[PDB]
Symmetry: D5
Subunit: 197 residues, 10 copies
């Protein structure tokens, strides 16, 4: 309804200063050609659902890197606020050490480009975007503020799109690795339908 994120088309480009391993570093979309990217926005540092999502994504970051997919969090908070939140104990509502970059969208350019800027507060909705190695947006997930996302589902979706990318088949509802796929044509698909019904 706003912005430029469109399925099947190049994801909007972005550059931003991020906190990588306690240091500041420029992070641009072009750095991730050939790799999948899970880009997830969140409203505000030093809040409540926010740390649980960032922590949950950090702990399982390697599950995504095992598949060739980097995970990136982003909010309108500055890199100094990100760093401060990282230097805050998790017991205190902080993030602690982090295995994922934390981008600063202080110009709101990313949140506006991805159409997740809650304009009346100036903060980003819980928007999650899956971008493939070719730079093409494949999935959109936006939650209202009071409900956090699921890292299980984000992994399931990344796995799904990577599978159909290589093997030319499609993933049924609920597909997890090891589940049957469907050959997307009228004749070859009868194999699947007769087996599972």
């Amino acid at each position: 309804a706003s912005g430029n994120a469109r399925i099947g088309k190049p994801a909007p480009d972005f550059k931003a200063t991020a906190v990588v391993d306690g240091a500041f570093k420029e992070v641009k979309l072009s750095d991730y050609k050939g790799k999948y990217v899970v880009l997830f926005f969140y409203p505000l540092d030093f809040t409540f659902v926010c740390p649980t999502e960032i922590i949950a994504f950090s702990n399982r970051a390697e599950d995504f890197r095992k598949l060739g997919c980097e995970v990136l969090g982003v909010s309108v908070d500055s890199q100094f606020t990100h760093l401060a939140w990282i230097n805050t104990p998790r017991k205190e509502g902080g993030l602690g050490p982090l295995n994922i970059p934390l981008l600063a969208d202080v110009t709101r350019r990313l949140s506006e480009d991805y159409g997740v800027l809650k304009t009346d507060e100036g903060i980003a909705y819980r928007g999650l975007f899956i971008i493939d190695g070719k730079g093409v947006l494949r999935q959109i997930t936006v939650n209202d503020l009071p409900v956090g996302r699921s890292v299980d589902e984000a992994l399931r979706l990344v796995q799904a799109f990577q599978y159909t990318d290589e093997h030319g088949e499609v993933c049924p509802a609920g597909w997890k690795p090891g589940s049957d796929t469907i050959k997307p044509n009228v004749d070859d698909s009868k194999e699947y339908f007769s087996k599972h019904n």
Copy 2:
């Protein structure tokens, strides 16, 4: 973020002819005031990922209705095509009898209002939307065509939003019924952060 679909604001109204228990009947958003609605678009009848999703939601329809949530599927196919597909056995790629309405969007207005129309083909991306009892859009999920969605995740989101609605607390990442929630303010949130860290 979808055509007229804006999280936090009223969901785009819709009125359509649907197949309901093997017969044609009008379906409107106004019929579900006071109830949650899970509205999922799908591209085409008589294809591949499509039947697995429609069957998955139909099989779980009553799990949603116990929570006061109604599941509605929709594509640009006519109600006559819907009925022919329902009268096709699942062993043949058909839908068999269904426990959820199947709306017809032949004018493509519903797809356009929800910003999910793959313009170059005239069909709807796998856009799923969660609306609460007050008619407010709470959740946007849109997949590219080759990957199905998750009924479990859709049910988790409905449950989470119904919980935050009732108890004024926010749901952490991966929340599921019985999991702990956070009191969203600086003082009362420490209860949660210290417990789980």
Copy 3:
């Protein structure tokens, strides 16, 4: 009143997926240079007048190919719905095996280019267009939904336009093969009018 179908001008170009002898094939207007084409739109698959027109033309398909004229049916339904209709028995309202191509206009682009889209329902009126070997539109016929067309009249018109194409004379009202024509000039035309009055 809408579209680009103008008599005496090149027929609006079209490109579509069609079900040809049970399989999917691309169909272009350029494929039919030197041959006549009867392009007939119909509203919806799995309806009532629709199957009778498609079956009628399909049966008489060779009556047209003998004259070097291909017959093409089109609706906004997809090629998957077309095939499912072909695989339904005619006794149940289906098409059965088909001797003509059935094109899919899921983008509604053909129906808009030929100005036959019923905008309020998103379906095509019963529009029928006769195109000569040079790609020029020679005839327009559009019926409101409740009344089917006539295959006999369509054939009579194809025969009359090819005759005048070949001999430069003009066909009177009700002309059928073997009836007298008129030489279109003041002097020679009197041969006809003296005989027939």
Copy 4:
């Protein structure tokens, strides 16, 4: 599909001077509310296909009036040119006495409103329009200049539209008085499909 002439919409109103029984008279569409109307345009008086269509319709005018349908011919020629042509013997390419009004569209407004004006010559294509008693346009037929129309087909169409108006059924392809009709709902339509297959 013709200028302001749109199927299912009110036919464009018109007012014109006509020759009626060898005399001049004003003719308006509103004069025929409650009756069906066949309005056929034609390019030029004192030409070749033109008299055969006008004569044919005149000869069969009473067959249409038995059905409550009035026939009207129109061209851009004036009423004085019409009258001189009526006063020319049919043996000599004239019209002789006529039993149908003959309207003069000297302003070309009727031809422009019904979208049949061949602009490069300023004359009307062979456009025929069937309008019901309610003033709603039900059928559009337009031929290129070389080929005349069929009065039998126009009569078949008036009959069919009057049958569907009164009974609420629909007319299959090729329907004539004495042919089976279809009841246009999924269940009742089966009566027809098993009888005729």
Copy 5:
């Protein structure tokens, strides 16, 4: 007030089908390079003032041709209507054989370009135009419909313009061949004034 006819500027170009010696011929202004032209519009064939003007100019056609001036009539009627009128006897209101071309302006282009189209009826006023051998318009005459023009005056004007073209003198009011003219400069004009007063 309308059109492009301006004294002292190139007369609007025109090209039309015409009846010339009972046969159809294309006629265009560029055919008359170097010759004077009298172009007279008249409203309708088979009317009343019209034939008397057409006959009067046809009979005097050679009077104009001896001066290198070609006379052209034109109305919005078709060439076929012209020809049918030429083949009507003058005793019956016809034209009989003619010595001047009769142009057919079915597109109303000539009438519009020369600003003589009575819009509310689609017919030309009695506009007469005199054009010199260089293509420049010298005289405009337009009569309301109920009053015919004067061929004597048209000839007088052609004579006057040709005399002034050659000798650089100017023609007093009522001038005819043989009358005194004025040398248009202050000193030499006294010759005329002192003699004629």
Copy 6:
């Protein structure tokens, strides 16, 4: 056809200072309600064709007034120049005493309203206009500068229009008082045609 001068329409209104019987007085079109008006423009005072036209009309003014027609001359020159010219002997190129008003169009509003201004020189062409007692324009006559008009033809035109106004018949070509007129209908017009042919 001139600026706002349209045949069959209310003549453009005008208001001017004029020289009348040697004195200045305001003249306006509303003064001549119920009387015919011959309004003739001329380019410039103290030139050559101009005085011959003005003097010719002044000498025959009473021939028009007997018919209830008032003749008015107009040029862009001022009333002071008009009066100096009236006071110049005719032997010297002057007008002498006048029997018609001479209007001063110093603002060029009359020439612009009547579409007779020669823009590259700021002077009026030899435009002549006949307005009936009802204020309607009946005749336009515009000559290029070198050739004067004919008072004879203007009187004939006034007589013709007055005759058609009173009797409802129409004046043929070259009609003069005493000539036969035509009753403008198909049947009654045969009296004239058979008589004169």
Copy 7:
């Protein structure tokens, strides 16, 4: 407020037919490169203040030419009216023989370009303009109609602008030839101020 005459800028070009020593001659502003020009407009020939101005400037013309300055009169009257006025004795309100050109601004362009056109009457206000040898406008004087200008003042101004052009000093109020001038800088200007106070 209107036009293009701006002091300190190139005077607007002009080109007009004029009366010079009893004959018609073209006059352009470029004719006067290297000389001063006093261009004075006046409303109407054969009026009242006008002749006294034209005569005053004519009698004093040589006083201007001795200084290299040409005087030019202009009005919207034609050169023929000018000459007629020149050929009218002064005792009768005429100009008699003139020693200055009299330009004819019949198109009102000169009056428009110099912004002196009294629009509601189409005549020129009493605008006087002093152009220097380089074609630059140096002085503007415009009087309402009832009050004539001063030839003495115009001469004083020409003399003054020619003094400052040559010596680089500037002329005080009321400066006449022989009066003191001021050196335009702070220190040298004190020579003047101490002297005269």
Copy 8:
């Protein structure tokens, strides 16, 4: 002819802070209704021609007030600069005591409204304007910067317009109190012309 300053029209309104007898005071055009106003702009305080003009008017101020005319000087300089200049002795290029108001056009609105703003420098040309008791502009005078104006000519003009206002006669060239005037009509003006030629 200056910005909004038009002869024969209401003078552009103005309001300004002015120095009046050593003190600051608002001065408006509406203060002078019923009185004549001489309003002269000048470029800059503490320059060279400027003081000679201001002193000349100040010294003659009462000669104008005896006629019911008030003299106002204006420049873009502030009222504090005006006072400083007044407090500067005349021997030093100052103004000394002043008998006329000095307006401060610091916003440059007066100079712009009167079309005398030399834009490239931001100062006013030597524009003098004469306004009658009705608020109507009667005279415009504008010199380039190097040449000063004439207080004698300004007084002559005021006397002349006041004279023509009272008596309805017009003032010839160079008129001064005591000189003959002309009765502005053709007949009465002869008195003046025969007397003076």
Copy 9:
């Protein structure tokens, strides 16, 4: 000079969430009617010059309140980031306890309204604005990021504007309490200039 911030006009209204005594509270300009306001923007929380400015103002907060002036700091950081910074010890680069509100401007509306937003970074320049008890903007101070402002100067300006507000005198350069003021008129100002020179 700042977006909507203009000296001498009402200051841009603002409403924001601020940290006030360790808690969250709304702050709006209307709360400060009758009191002076020093509103100082700063780029980012957890940075370097920023805390020194906030601490310097916090330490002097009462010095402004004794003068009826409230100090307010604002950045684009959220109130949660503000509080985290407040709960960080000063020796660590934190703010520690504070005695001035810290407004959050995460919609950037305050910064944009006061024209201090560094657009390419999304953060506010070091803009300080002084607002009087009546809500009028009296002073603007904007520093590039590297250089901090001076609380002394801010206090001096508040004292100065309150003094001139009360006594209607003006404060010379460098004015501090005890220093002389000037009576702003020509006469009374001489007291000051003679004393101090």
Copy 10:
């Protein structure tokens, strides 16, 4: 809110006539490349706060030049008024001899380019601007009219920007030469914060 002066961007270029050492001279920003510039606007010559700021800056001019910083004064008054004020003794409200240039902004171009024009009066607010040697604007100070600026604070700001320019560190609040600075990165800034807290 108006103009083009933006911190961090090239200062608006300017060029003006100025008074330097009692003589007129052109001053332009390009003349000060490599040097800091303090450009201070002031409303009006010969007023009250203004002379105290000009004299104060003139007295301290060398303190700025020892730093490589030039001071320029500018108002809308002309250079002739600037010089007159300089030649007025300070005891009388004058400026006396000066050691800084005084620019004349008679076209208001500089005041408009720097956004300090008080449009309603045509004078400049007390806007002060600090430009570094590269031409970049570093500081904006604007005071309402009744309160003068501080030459001490201006000198402080210049030193701070020159220090940060040279040493890359950043100046805390109240920094004066000799005080400690901050190293603007998270780690190195701790040096400062522990020492001073």
